[PDB]
């Protein structure tokens, strides 16, 4: 399992 | 703010 | 599947 | 207010 | 695909 | 009223 | 691509 | 910033 998390820079 | 989440399919 | 959700800051 | 939603293609 | 929808505040 | 819509390139 | 369109309210 | 982490299933 490869998880992804975050927020898009500049938005 | 634009959040991003989940998992990479196939991994 | 990597979902995305939010709003554009400043708009 | 500008909504952002969806998923990252390929993930 | 990451969609965007709204209006510019104040305008 | 000033609408904003579309999709973020590369996503 | 994120498009923007309308008119400034009150003007 | 959108972080990615985990391990590949089956390996």
Curated annotation (Swiss-Prot), chains A, B, C, D, E, F, G, H:
Q: Span within the entire protein?
A: 29 to 39 of 154
Q: What is this protein called?
A: Superoxide dismutase [Cu-Zn]
Q: What kind of modification does the protein receive after translation?
A: The ditryptophan cross-link at Trp-5 is responsible for the non-disulfide-linked homodimerization. Such modification might only occur in extreme conditions and additional experimental evidence is required.
**Origin: domain of life:** Eukaryota
Q: Look up the further comments and give them.
A: The protein (both wild-type and ALS1 variants) has a tendency to form fibrillar aggregates in the absence of the intramolecular disulfide bond or of bound zinc ions. These aggregates may have cytotoxic effects. Zinc binding promotes dimerization and stabilizes the native form.
Family, as annotated: Belongs to the Cu-Zn superoxide dismutase family.
Which residue numbers mark the cross-link 1-(tryptophan-3-yl)-tryptophan (Trp-Trp) (interchain with W-33) in this sequence?
5
Subunit organization:
Homodimer; non-disulfide-linked. Homodimerization may take place via the ditryptophan cross-link at Trp-5. Heterodimer with SOD1. The heterodimer CCS:SOD1 interacts with SLC31A1; this heterotrimer is Cu(1+)-mediated and its maintenance is regulated through SOD1 activation. Interacts with DAOA; the interaction is direct.
Annotated disease: Amyotrophic lateral sclerosis 1: A neurodegenerative disorder affecting upper motor neurons in the brain and lower motor neurons in the brain stem and spinal cord, resulting in fatal paralysis. Sensory abnormalities are absent. The pathologic hallmarks of the disease include pallor of the corticospinal tract due to loss of motor neurons, presence of ubiquitin-positive inclusions within surviving motor neurons, and deposition of pathologic aggregates. The etiology of amyotrophic lateral sclerosis is likely to be multifactorial, involving both genetic and environmental factors.
Biological function: Destroys radicals which are normally produced within the cells and which are toxic to biological systems.
Q: Where in the cell is it found?
A: Cytoplasm; Nucleus
């Amino acid at each position: 399992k490869v998880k992804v998390w975050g927020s898009i820079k500049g938005l």
